Design a protein around this ligand. Structure first.
Ligand SMILES: Nc1nc2c(ncn2[C@@H]2O[C@H](COP(=O)(O)OP(=O)(O)OP(=O)(O)O)[C@@H](O)[C@H]2O)c(=O)[nH]1
Ligand SMILES: Nc1nc2c(ncn2[C@@H]2O[C@H](COP(=O)(O)OP(=O)(O)O)[C@@H](O)[C@H]2O)c(=O)[nH]1
Ligand SMILES: Nc1nc2c(ncn2[C@@H]2O[C@H](COP(=O)(O)OP(=O)(O)O)[C@@H](O)[C@H]2O)c(=O)[nH]1
Ligand SMILES: [Mg+2]
Lengths: 29, 49, 430, 89, 426, 429
């Protein structure tokens, strides 16, 4: 099934959505 | 069948034939207004929001 | 410059190569007329008028399935003499295609190998697509691989062979023709990718939600694998692999050259856009036993060597972070003489979808070619069938009356009985 | 053993013979005089009085004796394209 | 490219062959005149299997019609399709055997095979790659069982490395259409088992059951019984002339269905059969066809498969259809009916799929089956043969035509040995 | 960065959850296709709370939809916003429960939760910081009660330290719509008290009275009732996604509103409701909203505030307003209702203020109450249970499947214990 793939860790989201380490990813820009 | 139609046309004048035909009610077109198709119209109060 | 010569033998080879060579046309943007509207030179040789012709070979002993290609959409793409047809098939018999009917047509096939090698300024090796359960795909193949080894010495001989399924089946005498063809796949072969049909019947059911598939739904999943393997030769990437390169990282002993094939992700068009397909998720679907394209559980066996082939927008950091998660899993076991069992090949091009196809448009993909010890389990159930019918001497007169001795039945059982014996010797922890 | 009658008399396996092509293409007569002694409640309530025009059916191949391809929609009347001609276009 | 030569002997073989050559003239769009009137171009790419070309686009069958009595040769000629048969393909005499095996095999049927073998060797060399031979006749008759088995011995010496295939009409247990039918059944079967590779036994009571029970017909004449038989002959060779997913010719069936040289007696069946009422209400799907093939009520041989064990089974499909439901359904019938298959061989069922269903039909299938329950057919004749032989009845019709009594002794000795062979492997 | 997983169980819970997803998608500016169409940049700052990013810049909800029937699932899928959901999370059976708690919890619902917890684990273990769970259901049925509380029990079992928000439509005195409703109401509180952190009660009679008197709607359909429930639902979690002066998350509310571990049934409300006949005449001020909170007609449960005492009051305002008027007004109401609030807890009222109002209105307010007056509903449910249990009516449908008689008496004992705790802590100096 589509859930047969792993539930995984982390999700990318996008650049306007602020998540954990959004500040650290912003710091390199 | 045409002679029976003659007989029933003559026999339609009876009170019993007006009040009670077989498997039906009487004629409702005197009761309802002229020119209204009965099975197409809707009876009741419509609920509008 | 680097280029591969593909060989298709039997009815399976023609119908796998029917749904394989429609993707080589679509990946390089080559019309069915044979014209475009250096990566294409691995299979398509230029002509002065602008025409591209495939460097493949199509072999069968019956003209019933190749005549459909000759009167189909791709009647102009293939060379007229590049498709060799016999007059009578081998009819589920190993004896027919190896001794009697397979001899009169091998002179025409071997002539085209000597001709196609002449235009090749540099040849990497051969690829074979055939079936164990047939008369041509296992009988004509058995003396062709004997014949190719003498003329070309150290060339690579890869193989994509259709293994018989564990439960479902087509022919009655497939355990005989599976036994006698393994004698030639041991010393005259180099690395043999087997797939079966039940394990891909499972895939189209629970993943693509196709309740009633056919071979043309199975053949495009097999056709997806070979384009992922060859993808390093054709298109630019961060780290390319070669046909000689990934035999070294996958075959530790000359008798141990039997991997498993796995492809992920496999989801339809509707289901794909609600999910996110990360690099960690596509490399974790491959290690599940439900995505094996051979009906074997790797929990019973032990991994020996593995190779990862990547396509699309993959970053090398997340591959390292996802593989390191796998190595902390207690379920996945590796044999102690292989502390480093991973080979990583990265390619830039995302995969291409065909019109009318079942798979979806994806940005990244992965195809793992895993060598494992859980194939001796699959070879156990076939010898449980073979000696169950050989004890009563069933069907033997079909073989002896056509040209072999009856002694080839006893030795070819004794040949691969020691082959299973060698698998538990390798699996002993050092 | 059994007294075989015509098709009309509802005796034995009349239904399959009424399904046969001949008993379909036979016409149905109009209602006639002295027909009011033969009207039933089901005929008066759950039937239709429109006259029915009979139909003529063209000849098609027959493969087994019970086969009637005449009463079929215009589909699968021609030879199907194979797997190659269907998938590879 | 792979040509089938048809042989017809006797009155029964001539009457079936008129219907068999009718349905494949109907399948390829061949009119009774001889020309072609069809729609698709896949009906002519492999038509040389059954028809020879001529001038003016005329196709004529590669069939020979043989009978010692010209009574039925005026009826197969005056039929609907009686013009497409070649005038030189009729070999005949006067004195028909009259339900005697001696007259057809030693005296009257001896000088007629010289003209027949002249015709066959003329047709055999006209093929590019001859695929085999095909015959249909009756074992209970005089000409078909008398002479048609003499050709079977005669042809197999000229062309040994070919395929022999018969559709023989075995005697029924109850109808008893001939007084001396166990004599001509016993003597032919003794000669069949060493000169045949594929034997499809057809019986008249088994076809009479199907029309009454499955088809719901009240007048099943011989024009109906021959049509179900002619459907089976068409469905056997369906992958030899049409493309498909997984093809199977006459050699590929015989190599999977015959494990031992004396186990070559098959038990036919056909699949999509429904009444006149159940056409618009029944969905032609793969489960419905598989449920109907394996049932005993839709069988053309008068033997119950539930009283024996299936050695090997062949299933030959047709039409655009899905291969997964093919493999799941005949694995389920193998799994559920574990007691009706022998356990010393796995995968008793063979698969074959074409892409061309017959016109007007959606999906079709043909059931070819080896089973040890056909020994019930032979023990009935063997118990009938010794009841007449112990009183030496009717023997002067046989020993008065050059036959010794030893051919009566050996024919019971061989058929007793074959039913001793099916019993061992059960 | 704090994530809430939503679950929809039962027909009523499914429809209310679908209306909730529509309401918050309109709040965040997500069209039903799955893209973003908004004017303010504050909508996308906290979208990881309710939504997952997909491939191609689309958004999917973090909810699962479970029901034993395929009818309401097809209705939601064919509804307005049914396209945004994901098809793998549509887990459903074939055989209906028939409003049988034993069918929901023991036989038919036993085989589906093994697949339900799989997708719950998939959507939960990939989260960065799982804040808690939010389930929508109704008490009076067999599907919305049985397998609902089963999911609550198993999720509380496997995640020990989280927060659960169960929004439940409760039985009502005059608007009874099920015959076995006292039985299936009493059979679920035994699991709701033990393994749930905040249970929010909704009463259909109160919704009807609000739609008739305050709103003066002539045709108050179930769409309107579910919109009221969803608008009250989103207000308590505005503060996890929107900026404000005085932020207050779900555990903030839990600590401020749960003094004893078995008193966590809350009565909620929406505060700016008005009819458009008098919208022109009514003035929007903070004192007017403050008086609007404490109206008994506003109360969305069939309980009288006059017939009890108030333990804790919470109020979440949305919009631009000063704080001295808020503090002064919500001290003045406690002063003027001196005899009604408990004396052993001073400062009964918590106020929070957010900077973003709902779309279409200048300011709004969500009022949540924990009061001792809620014992009337439990008392009448227990009385109906005893009146049915004296003659054991409708009990063979439970006893013939695997449910014992003694669990009914155990649940009745727990109901009696709960109302005893309410009365004891109401009458204490
Ligand atoms: N998955 C898959 N398997 C195929 C396909 N075509 C053929 N096969 C395999 O081939 C087997 C059938 O035997 P064939 O390959 O046709 O036999 P053959 O190699 O042509 O040998 P002969 O028929 O004797 O000439 C089946 O069991 C299938 O597993 C295909 O398109 N896809
Ligand atoms: N099913 C079927 N059986 C037939 C047909 N014609 C004849 N028979 C059978 O064949 C038997 C007689 O064969 P016969 O004419 O004596 O063969 P011959 O002596 O070789 O000509 C009878 O028992 C019939 O039942 C037919 O068209 N269909
Ligand atoms: N507000 C609201 N309540 C509903 C709706 N549908 C059903 N209900 C309530 O649910 C109660 C019946 O619960 P029921 O649907 O039988 O539970 P289930 O069988 O588990 O789904 C009734 O008392 C109704 O008041 C709805 O669309 N909106
Ligand atoms: Mg072949």
């Amino acid at each position: 099934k589509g859930s047969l793939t792993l539930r995984s860790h982390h999700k990318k989201y996008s650049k306007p959505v602020l998540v954990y380490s959004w500040h650290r990813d912003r710091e390199a820009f | 069948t045409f002679q029976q139609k003659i007989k029933d046309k003559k026999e339609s004048i009876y009170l019993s034939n007006r009040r009670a035909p077989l498997g039906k009610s009487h004629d409702q077109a005197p009761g309802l207004p002229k020119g209204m198709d009965t099975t197409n119209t809707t009876f009741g109060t419509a609920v509008i929001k | 410059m680097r280029e591969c010569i593909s060989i298709h033998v039997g009815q399976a080879g023609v119908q796998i190569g029917n749904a394989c060579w429609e993707l080589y046309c679509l990946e390089h943007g080559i019309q069915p007329d044979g014209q475009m509207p250096d990566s294409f030179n691995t299979f398509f040789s230029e002509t002065g008028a602008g025409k591209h012709v495939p460097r493949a070979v199509f072999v069968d002993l019956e003209p019933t399935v190749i005549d459909e290609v000759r009167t189909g959409t791709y009647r102009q793409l293939f060379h007229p003499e590049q498709l060799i047809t016999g007059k009578e098939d081998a009819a589920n018999n190993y004896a027919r295609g190896h001794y009697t009917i397979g001899k009169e047509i091998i002179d025409l096939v071997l002539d085209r190998i000597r001709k196609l090698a002449d235009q090749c300024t540099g040849l990497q090796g051969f690829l074979v697509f055939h079936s164990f359960g047939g008369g041509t795909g296992s009988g004509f193949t058995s003396l062709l691989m004997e014949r190719l080894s003498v003329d070309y010495g150290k060339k690579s001989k890869l193989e994509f062979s259709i293994y018989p399924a564990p439960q479902v089946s087509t022919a009655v005498v497939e355990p005989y023709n599976s036994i006698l063809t393994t004698h030639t796949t041991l010393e005259h072969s180099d690395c043999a990718f087997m797939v079966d049909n039940e394990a891909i019947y499972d895939i189209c059911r629970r993943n693509l939600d196709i309740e009633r598939p056919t071979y043309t739904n199975l053949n495009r999943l097999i056709g997806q694998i070979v384009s992922s393997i060859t993808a390093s030769l054709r298109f630019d990437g961060a780290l390319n692999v070669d046909l000689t390169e990934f035999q070294t990282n996958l075959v530790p002993y000359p008798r141990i050259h039997f991997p498993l094939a796995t492809y992920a992700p496999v989801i339809s068009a509707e289901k794909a856009y609600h999910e996110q397909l990360s690099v960690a998720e596509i490399t974790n679907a491959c290690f599940e036993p439900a995505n094996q394209m051979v009906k074997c559980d790797p929990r019973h066996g032990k991994y020996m060597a593995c190779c990862l082939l990547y396509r699309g927008d993959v970053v090398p950091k997340d591959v390292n972070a996802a593989i390191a998660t796998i190595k902390t899993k207690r379920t996945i076991q590796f044999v102690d003489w292989c502390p480093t069992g991973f080979k990583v090949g990265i390619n830039y091009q995302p995969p291409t979808v065909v019109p009318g196809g079942d798979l979806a448009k994806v940005q990244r993909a992965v195809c793992m070619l895993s060598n494992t010890t859980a194939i001796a389990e699959a070879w156990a159930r076939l010898d449980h069938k073979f000696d169950l019918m050989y004890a009563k001497r069933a069907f033997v007169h079909w073989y002896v009356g056509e040209g072999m001795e009856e002694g080839e039945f006893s030795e070819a059982r004794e040949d691969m009985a020691a082959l299973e014996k060698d698998y538990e010797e390798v699996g002993v922890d050092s | 053993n059994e007294n075989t009658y015509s098709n009309r008399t509802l005796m034995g396996n009349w239904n399959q013979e009424r399904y046969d092509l001949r008993n379909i293409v036979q016409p149905k007569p109009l209602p006639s005089q002295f027909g009011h002694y033969f009207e039933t409640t089901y005929d008066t309530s759950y039937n239709n009085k429109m006259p029915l025009s009979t139909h003529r059916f063209k000849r098609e191949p027959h493969w087994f004796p019970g086969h009637q391809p005449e009463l079929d929609p215009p589909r699968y009347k021609c030879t199907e394209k194979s797997t190659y001609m269907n998938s590879y276009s | 490219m792979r040509e089938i030569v048809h042989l017809q002997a006797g009155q029964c073989g001539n009457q079936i062959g008129a219907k068999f050559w009718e349905v494949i003239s109907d399948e390829h769009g061949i009119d009774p005149t001889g020309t072609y009137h069809g729609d698709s171009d896949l009906q002519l790419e492999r038509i040389n299997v059954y028809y020879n070309e001529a001038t003016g686009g005329k196709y004529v069958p590669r069939a020979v019609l043989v009978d010692l009595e010209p009574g039925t040769m005026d009826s197969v000629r005056s039929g609907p399709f009686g013009q497409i048969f070649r005038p030189d393909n009729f070999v005949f005499g006067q004195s028909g055997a009259g339900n005697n095996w001696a007259k057809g095999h030693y005296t009257e049927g001896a000088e007629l095979v010289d003209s027949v073998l002249d015709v066959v060797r003329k047709e055999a060399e006209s093929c590019d790659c001859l695929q085999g031979f095909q015959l249909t006749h009756s074992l209970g008759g005089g000409t078909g069982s008398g002479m048609g088995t003499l050709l079977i011995s005669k042809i197999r010496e000229e062309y040994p490395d070919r395929i022999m295939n018969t559709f023989s009409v075995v005697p029924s247990p109850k109808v008893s259409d001939t007084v001396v039918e166990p004599y001509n059944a016993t003597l032919s079967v003794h000669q069949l088992v060493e000169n045949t590779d594929e034997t499809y036994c057809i019986d008249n009571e088994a076809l009479y059951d199907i029309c009454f029970r499955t088809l719901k017909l009240t007048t099943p004449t011989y024009g109906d019984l021959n049509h179900l038989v002619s459907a089976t002959m068409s469905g056997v060779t369906t992958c030899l002339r049409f493309p498909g997913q997984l093809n199977a010719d006459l050699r590929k069936l015989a190599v999977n269905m015959v494990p031992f040289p004396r186990l070559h007696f098959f038990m036919p069946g056909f699949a999509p059969l429904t009444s006149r009422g159940s056409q618009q209400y029944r969905a032609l799907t793969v489960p419905e066809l598989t449920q109907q093939m394996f049932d005993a009520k839709n069988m053309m041989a008068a033997c119950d498969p539930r009283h024996g064990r299936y050695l090997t089974v062949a299933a030959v499909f047709r039409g655009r259809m899905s291969m997964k439901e093919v493999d799941e359904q005949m694995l389920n019938v193998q799994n559920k009916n574990s007691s009706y298959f022998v356990e010393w061989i796995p995968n008793n069922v063979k698969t074959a799929v074409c892409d061309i269903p017959p016109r007007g039909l959606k999906m079709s299938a043909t059931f070819i089956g080896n089973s040890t329950a056909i020994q019930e057919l032979f023990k009935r004749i063997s118990e009938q043969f010794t009841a007449m032989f112990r009183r030496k009845a009717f023997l002067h019709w046989y020993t008065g035509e050059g036959m010794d009594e030893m051919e009566f002794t050996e024919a019971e000795s061989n058929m007793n040995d074959l039913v001793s062979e099916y019993q061992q492997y059960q």
